[PDB]
Amino acid sequence: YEIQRERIELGRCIGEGQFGDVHQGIYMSPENPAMAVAIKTCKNCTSDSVREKFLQEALTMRQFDHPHIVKLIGVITENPVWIIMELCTLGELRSFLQVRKFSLDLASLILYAYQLSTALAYLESKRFVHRDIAARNVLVSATDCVKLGDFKLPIKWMAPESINFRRFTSASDVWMFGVCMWEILMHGVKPFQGVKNNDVIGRIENGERLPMPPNCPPTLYSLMTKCWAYDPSRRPRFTELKAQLSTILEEEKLQ
């Protein structure tokens, strides 16, 4: 998985990343003389601590093989340290949804939720807990294809047991996925705008939930509310979510 720097040509910056900017580029390989790729960079990769954390993402990504999870191409482990990955040409999902708010029909939004549920059912089958399921960590490969793109606390996405007890489980992932579905149906609007992080927990304990988005089918909001059962053991698993989203998707396509 180590790629020689000479085989990568760094191009345009396509966005921000947790550790540094993400660029598009060209990987000139023996198998493919000019492959479009994404190049994740790391500011302060001279820090042994930062670099370890940065490259752990590559180690994680390498374990997975799923059509809706971004693939690792390789790594450059000398300064400046880069992660080479599959290019999702349409960028971050949040941005994509905001710009294309009136071009995207409901069927596309439900498709995106379904596709993410297939990736999360796969991770669930490997007993991998993500911890940070949110629209900002989803990339758009094509108008009909999204992928899980990335591996202070995001309080507004977090399950109550995560907030209260620092407990992250497959159940808390389902809660977070519920919020992610809400973000998608809200065209990339953040949950709890105008609320301080400190008050969010009070509202969940009081029994408040994110409201039904405009034009959200009642079946889908019902599914979101199941994801937000306060008791973790009452929440669905991703296998059920995946099957239910498929049904809802076909219902919407039949419309």
mmCIF file of C-alpha atoms in Angstrom:
data_model
loop_
_atom_site.group_PDB
_atom_site.id
_atom_site.type_symbol
_atom_site.label_atom_id
_atom_site.label_comp_id
_atom_site.label_asym_id
_atom_site.label_seq_id
_atom_site.Cartn_x
_atom_site.Cartn_y
_atom_site.Cartn_z
ATOM 1 C CA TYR A 1 0.000 0.000 0.000
ATOM 2 C CA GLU A 2 3.003 2.418 0.052
ATOM 3 C CA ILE A 3 2.945 4.577 -3.092
ATOM 4 C CA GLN A 4 5.982 6.467 -4.381
ATOM 5 C CA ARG A 5 5.491 10.270 -4.292
ATOM 6 C CA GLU A 6 6.690 10.508 -7.913
ATOM 7 C CA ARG A 7 3.569 8.589 -9.046
ATOM 8 C CA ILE A 8 1.179 11.158 -7.522
ATOM 9 C CA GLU A 9 0.480 14.563 -9.032
ATOM 10 C CA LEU A 10 -1.296 16.819 -6.522
ATOM 11 C CA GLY A 11 -4.098 18.870 -8.081
ATOM 12 C CA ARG A 12 -6.881 21.179 -6.903
ATOM 13 C CA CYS A 13 -7.972 21.412 -3.258
ATOM 14 C CA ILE A 14 -11.454 19.879 -3.146
ATOM 15 C CA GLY A 15 -12.181 20.375 0.567
ATOM 16 C CA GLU A 16 -11.275 20.500 4.244
ATOM 17 C CA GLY A 17 -10.439 17.447 6.362
ATOM 18 C CA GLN A 18 -10.030 16.649 10.055
ATOM 19 C CA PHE A 19 -6.206 16.628 9.819
ATOM 20 C CA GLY A 20 -5.736 18.878 6.776
ATOM 21 C CA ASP A 21 -6.992 19.781 3.315
ATOM 22 C CA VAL A 22 -8.159 17.169 0.818
ATOM 23 C CA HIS A 23 -7.020 17.494 -2.805
ATOM 24 C CA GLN A 24 -7.889 15.720 -6.013
ATOM 25 C CA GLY A 25 -4.986 14.336 -8.006
ATOM 26 C CA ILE A 26 -3.615 11.837 -10.490
ATOM 27 C CA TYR A 27 -2.058 8.482 -9.618
ATOM 28 C CA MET A 28 0.119 7.207 -12.464
ATOM 29 C CA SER A 29 0.338 3.482 -11.781
ATOM 30 C CA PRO A 30 1.536 0.374 -13.637
ATOM 31 C CA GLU A 31 -2.073 -0.887 -13.744
ATOM 32 C CA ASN A 32 -3.491 2.498 -14.809
ATOM 33 C CA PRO A 33 -1.349 5.309 -16.252
ATOM 34 C CA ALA A 34 -3.647 8.115 -15.024
ATOM 35 C CA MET A 35 -6.174 7.384 -12.264
ATOM 36 C CA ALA A 36 -8.150 10.238 -10.676
ATOM 37 C CA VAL A 37 -7.761 10.035 -6.884
ATOM 38 C CA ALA A 38 -8.432 11.953 -3.693
ATOM 39 C CA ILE A 39 -5.409 12.895 -1.578
ATOM 40 C CA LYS A 40 -5.904 13.513 2.145
ATOM 41 C CA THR A 41 -3.138 15.677 3.642
ATOM 42 C CA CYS A 42 -2.016 16.140 7.240
ATOM 43 C CA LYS A 43 -0.743 19.384 8.743
ATOM 44 C CA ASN A 44 1.588 18.679 11.682
ATOM 45 C CA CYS A 45 2.349 15.115 10.498
ATOM 46 C CA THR A 46 5.819 15.696 11.984
ATOM 47 C CA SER A 47 4.079 15.164 15.340
ATOM 48 C CA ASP A 48 4.284 11.407 15.965
ATOM 49 C CA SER A 49 0.919 11.526 17.782
ATOM 50 C CA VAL A 50 -1.003 13.301 14.980
ATOM 51 C CA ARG A 51 0.517 11.119 12.273
ATOM 52 C CA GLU A 52 -0.406 7.924 14.136
ATOM 53 C CA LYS A 53 -4.038 9.071 14.411
ATOM 54 C CA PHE A 54 -4.101 10.266 10.781
ATOM 55 C CA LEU A 55 -2.778 6.988 9.344
ATOM 56 C CA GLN A 56 -5.017 4.829 11.585
ATOM 57 C CA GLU A 57 -7.868 5.944 9.288
ATOM 58 C CA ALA A 58 -6.089 4.229 6.363
ATOM 59 C CA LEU A 59 -5.549 1.054 8.396
ATOM 60 C CA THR A 60 -9.281 1.094 9.256
ATOM 61 C CA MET A 61 -10.450 1.779 5.675
ATOM 62 C CA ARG A 62 -8.275 -1.078 4.367
ATOM 63 C CA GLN A 63 -10.329 -3.628 6.386
ATOM 64 C CA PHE A 64 -13.540 -2.843 4.489
ATOM 65 C CA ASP A 65 -14.833 -3.748 1.036
ATOM 66 C CA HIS A 66 -18.324 -2.415 0.311
ATOM 67 C CA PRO A 67 -19.851 -0.478 -2.621
ATOM 68 C CA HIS A 68 -20.909 2.403 -0.313
ATOM 69 C CA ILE A 69 -17.694 2.786 1.659
ATOM 70 C CA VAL A 70 -14.798 4.722 0.083
ATOM 71 C CA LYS A 71 -11.773 2.585 -0.831
ATOM 72 C CA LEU A 72 -8.143 3.062 0.151
ATOM 73 C CA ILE A 73 -5.702 3.231 -2.765
ATOM 74 C CA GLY A 74 -2.500 3.773 -0.794
ATOM 75 C CA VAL A 75 -0.402 5.814 1.608
ATOM 76 C CA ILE A 76 2.706 7.995 1.483
ATOM 77 C CA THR A 77 4.267 7.701 4.931
ATOM 78 C CA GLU A 78 7.138 10.205 4.618
ATOM 79 C CA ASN A 79 6.635 13.933 5.276
ATOM 80 C CA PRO A 80 4.263 15.318 4.072
ATOM 81 C CA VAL A 81 2.184 12.217 4.838
ATOM 82 C CA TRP A 82 -0.723 11.534 2.445
ATOM 83 C CA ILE A 83 -3.588 9.072 2.201
ATOM 84 C CA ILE A 84 -4.563 8.229 -1.384
ATOM 85 C CA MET A 85 -8.177 7.153 -1.839
ATOM 86 C CA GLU A 86 -11.059 6.718 -4.241
ATOM 87 C CA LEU A 87 -12.228 10.067 -5.660
ATOM 88 C CA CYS A 88 -15.873 10.915 -5.002
ATOM 89 C CA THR A 89 -16.141 13.647 -7.611
ATOM 90 C CA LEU A 90 -19.306 15.384 -6.326
ATOM 91 C CA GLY A 91 -17.824 16.089 -2.871
ATOM 92 C CA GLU A 92 -19.287 16.363 0.634
ATOM 93 C CA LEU A 93 -22.949 15.365 1.006
ATOM 94 C CA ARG A 94 -23.923 18.413 3.115
ATOM 95 C CA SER A 95 -22.673 20.834 0.444
ATOM 96 C CA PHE A 96 -24.158 18.713 -2.331
ATOM 97 C CA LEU A 97 -27.608 18.716 -0.689
ATOM 98 C CA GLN A 98 -27.508 22.488 -0.033
ATOM 99 C CA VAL A 99 -26.592 23.435 -3.626
ATOM 100 C CA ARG A 100 -28.955 20.879 -5.226
ATOM 101 C CA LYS A 101 -31.867 21.397 -2.829
ATOM 102 C CA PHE A 102 -34.424 21.980 -5.638
ATOM 103 C CA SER A 103 -32.939 19.553 -8.171
ATOM 104 C CA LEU A 104 -33.113 16.487 -5.926
ATOM 105 C CA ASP A 105 -36.404 14.641 -5.736
ATOM 106 C CA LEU A 106 -37.472 12.806 -2.607
ATOM 107 C CA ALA A 107 -36.575 9.427 -4.164
ATOM 108 C CA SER A 108 -32.900 10.516 -4.375
ATOM 109 C CA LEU A 109 -32.840 11.546 -0.695
ATOM 110 C CA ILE A 110 -34.322 8.206 0.372
ATOM 111 C CA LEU A 111 -31.868 6.405 -1.937
ATOM 112 C CA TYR A 112 -28.984 8.092 -0.102
ATOM 113 C CA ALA A 113 -30.370 6.957 3.281
ATOM 114 C CA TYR A 114 -30.816 3.435 1.919
ATOM 115 C CA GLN A 115 -27.267 3.289 0.511
ATOM 116 C CA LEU A 116 -25.789 4.474 3.806
ATOM 117 C CA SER A 117 -27.880 1.858 5.638
ATOM 118 C CA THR A 118 -26.307 -0.871 3.462
ATOM 119 C CA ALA A 119 -22.796 0.362 4.390
ATOM 120 C CA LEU A 120 -23.754 0.485 8.083
ATOM 121 C CA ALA A 121 -25.381 -2.983 7.984
ATOM 122 C CA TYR A 122 -22.051 -4.214 6.586
ATOM 123 C CA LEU A 123 -20.026 -2.539 9.369
ATOM 124 C CA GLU A 124 -22.546 -3.966 11.881
ATOM 125 C CA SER A 125 -21.872 -7.454 10.438
ATOM 126 C CA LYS A 126 -18.161 -6.901 11.171
ATOM 127 C CA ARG A 127 -18.962 -5.635 14.685
ATOM 128 C CA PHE A 128 -17.385 -2.269 13.870
ATOM 129 C CA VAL A 129 -18.751 0.749 15.749
ATOM 130 C CA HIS A 130 -18.364 3.999 13.772
ATOM 131 C CA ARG A 131 -19.050 6.601 16.535
ATOM 132 C CA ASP A 132 -19.548 9.597 14.185
ATOM 133 C CA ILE A 133 -22.336 8.921 11.704
ATOM 134 C CA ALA A 134 -23.345 12.276 10.239
ATOM 135 C CA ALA A 135 -23.864 13.854 6.819
ATOM 136 C CA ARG A 136 -20.477 15.646 6.966
ATOM 137 C CA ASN A 137 -18.773 12.214 6.801
ATOM 138 C CA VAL A 138 -20.621 11.112 3.646
ATOM 139 C CA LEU A 139 -19.221 11.704 0.139
ATOM 140 C CA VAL A 140 -21.091 11.805 -3.183
ATOM 141 C CA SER A 141 -19.707 9.624 -5.975
ATOM 142 C CA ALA A 142 -22.559 10.232 -8.424
ATOM 143 C CA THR A 143 -26.079 11.690 -8.337
ATOM 144 C CA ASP A 144 -27.315 8.161 -7.508
ATOM 145 C CA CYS A 145 -24.391 7.013 -5.300
ATOM 146 C CA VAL A 146 -23.170 8.110 -1.858
ATOM 147 C CA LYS A 147 -20.410 6.556 0.231
ATOM 148 C CA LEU A 148 -19.286 6.620 3.833
ATOM 149 C CA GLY A 149 -16.092 8.658 3.482
ATOM 150 C CA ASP A 150 -14.456 9.133 6.886
ATOM 151 C CA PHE A 151 -13.497 6.878 9.817
ATOM 152 C CA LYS A 152 -15.269 18.614 20.300
ATOM 153 C CA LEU A 153 -17.920 15.918 20.650
ATOM 154 C CA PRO A 154 -20.777 15.987 18.114
ATOM 155 C CA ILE A 155 -23.315 16.318 20.932
ATOM 156 C CA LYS A 156 -26.211 17.151 18.603
ATOM 157 C CA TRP A 157 -25.777 13.783 16.802
ATOM 158 C CA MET A 158 -25.033 11.674 19.885
ATOM 159 C CA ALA A 159 -27.193 9.101 21.655
ATOM 160 C CA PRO A 160 -28.044 9.979 25.291
ATOM 161 C CA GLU A 161 -25.966 7.068 26.661
ATOM 162 C CA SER A 162 -22.999 8.412 24.633
ATOM 163 C CA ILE A 163 -23.438 11.878 26.144
ATOM 164 C CA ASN A 164 -24.159 10.674 29.678
ATOM 165 C CA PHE A 165 -21.763 7.701 29.898
ATOM 166 C CA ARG A 166 -19.275 8.060 26.984
ATOM 167 C CA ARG A 167 -20.788 4.793 25.754
ATOM 168 C CA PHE A 168 -20.502 4.127 21.999
ATOM 169 C CA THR A 169 -22.173 0.979 20.661
ATOM 170 C CA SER A 170 -23.946 -0.313 17.545
ATOM 171 C CA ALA A 171 -27.109 1.037 19.221
ATOM 172 C CA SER A 172 -25.653 4.547 19.552
ATOM 173 C CA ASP A 173 -24.665 4.348 15.845
ATOM 174 C CA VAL A 174 -28.340 3.736 14.973
ATOM 175 C CA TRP A 175 -29.341 6.855 16.940
ATOM 176 C CA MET A 176 -26.734 8.842 14.995
ATOM 177 C CA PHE A 177 -27.948 7.349 11.693
ATOM 178 C CA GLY A 178 -31.434 8.598 12.599
ATOM 179 C CA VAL A 179 -30.032 12.131 12.846
ATOM 180 C CA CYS A 180 -28.152 11.639 9.555
ATOM 181 C CA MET A 181 -31.424 10.638 7.831
ATOM 182 C CA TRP A 182 -33.000 13.825 9.233
ATOM 183 C CA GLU A 183 -30.094 15.901 7.825
ATOM 184 C CA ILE A 184 -30.574 14.331 4.373
ATOM 185 C CA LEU A 185 -34.327 14.975 4.323
ATOM 186 C CA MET A 186 -33.600 18.539 5.563
ATOM 187 C CA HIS A 187 -31.220 19.118 2.599
ATOM 188 C CA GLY A 188 -28.103 19.321 4.765
ATOM 189 C CA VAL A 189 -29.412 21.556 7.548
ATOM 190 C CA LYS A 190 -27.748 20.848 10.913
ATOM 191 C CA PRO A 191 -29.823 19.459 13.791
ATOM 192 C CA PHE A 192 -30.673 21.784 16.708
ATOM 193 C CA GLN A 193 -29.644 25.111 15.135
ATOM 194 C CA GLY A 194 -29.896 27.861 17.760
ATOM 195 C CA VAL A 195 -29.435 25.419 20.661
ATOM 196 C CA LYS A 196 -26.295 25.267 22.795
ATOM 197 C CA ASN A 197 -24.647 21.821 23.023
ATOM 198 C CA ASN A 198 -25.207 21.836 26.796
ATOM 199 C CA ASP A 199 -29.028 22.035 26.463
ATOM 200 C CA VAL A 200 -29.404 19.256 23.868
ATOM 201 C CA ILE A 201 -29.238 16.521 26.511
ATOM 202 C CA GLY A 202 -31.940 18.248 28.582
ATOM 203 C CA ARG A 203 -34.243 18.233 25.553
ATOM 204 C CA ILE A 204 -33.733 14.498 24.831
ATOM 205 C CA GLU A 205 -34.369 13.634 28.496
ATOM 206 C CA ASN A 206 -37.501 15.793 28.328
ATOM 207 C CA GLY A 207 -38.565 13.599 25.377
ATOM 208 C CA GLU A 208 -38.126 16.129 22.565
ATOM 209 C CA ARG A 209 -37.039 14.892 19.141
ATOM 210 C CA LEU A 210 -36.142 16.508 15.833
ATOM 211 C CA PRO A 211 -39.358 17.403 13.975
ATOM 212 C CA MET A 212 -40.640 15.716 10.809
ATOM 213 C CA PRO A 213 -38.948 17.368 7.817
ATOM 214 C CA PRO A 214 -41.196 18.963 5.168
ATOM 215 C CA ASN A 215 -42.170 16.421 2.467
ATOM 216 C CA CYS A 216 -40.866 13.533 4.597
ATOM 217 C CA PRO A 217 -43.053 10.439 4.171
ATOM 218 C CA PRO A 218 -44.679 9.409 7.487
ATOM 219 C CA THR A 219 -43.208 5.887 7.169
ATOM 220 C CA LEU A 220 -39.713 7.421 7.114
ATOM 221 C CA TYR A 221 -40.214 9.743 10.110
ATOM 222 C CA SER A 222 -41.647 6.770 12.020
ATOM 223 C CA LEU A 223 -38.414 4.895 11.220
ATOM 224 C CA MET A 224 -36.351 7.888 12.432
ATOM 225 C CA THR A 225 -38.292 7.974 15.715
ATOM 226 C CA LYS A 226 -37.558 4.246 16.265
ATOM 227 C CA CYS A 227 -33.849 5.113 15.908
ATOM 228 C CA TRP A 228 -34.295 7.668 18.722
ATOM 229 C CA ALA A 229 -35.698 5.353 21.407
ATOM 230 C CA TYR A 230 -34.059 6.575 24.627
ATOM 231 C CA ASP A 231 -33.491 2.946 25.679
ATOM 232 C CA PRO A 232 -30.709 1.590 23.392
ATOM 233 C CA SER A 233 -32.100 -1.971 23.384
ATOM 234 C CA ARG A 234 -35.381 -0.781 21.789
ATOM 235 C CA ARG A 235 -33.641 0.707 18.718
ATOM 236 C CA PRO A 236 -33.642 -1.241 15.443
ATOM 237 C CA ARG A 237 -30.524 -2.840 13.972
ATOM 238 C CA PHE A 238 -29.235 -1.857 10.530
ATOM 239 C CA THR A 239 -30.558 -5.069 8.912
ATOM 240 C CA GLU A 240 -34.155 -3.993 9.719
ATOM 241 C CA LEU A 241 -33.432 -0.349 8.781
ATOM 242 C CA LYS A 242 -32.001 -1.465 5.425
ATOM 243 C CA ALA A 243 -35.045 -3.670 4.639
ATOM 244 C CA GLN A 244 -37.482 -0.921 5.691
ATOM 245 C CA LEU A 245 -35.690 1.814 3.704
ATOM 246 C CA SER A 246 -35.788 -0.460 0.624
ATOM 247 C CA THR A 247 -39.584 -0.779 0.940
ATOM 248 C CA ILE A 248 -39.960 2.982 1.488
ATOM 249 C CA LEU A 249 -37.718 3.670 -1.532
ATOM 250 C CA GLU A 250 -39.839 1.464 -3.821
ATOM 251 C CA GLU A 251 -43.058 3.057 -2.478
ATOM 252 C CA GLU A 252 -41.655 6.470 -3.413
ATOM 253 C CA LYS A 253 -40.483 5.288 -6.861
ATOM 254 C CA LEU A 254 -43.993 3.864 -7.504
ATOM 255 C CA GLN A 255 -45.210 7.457 -6.908
#
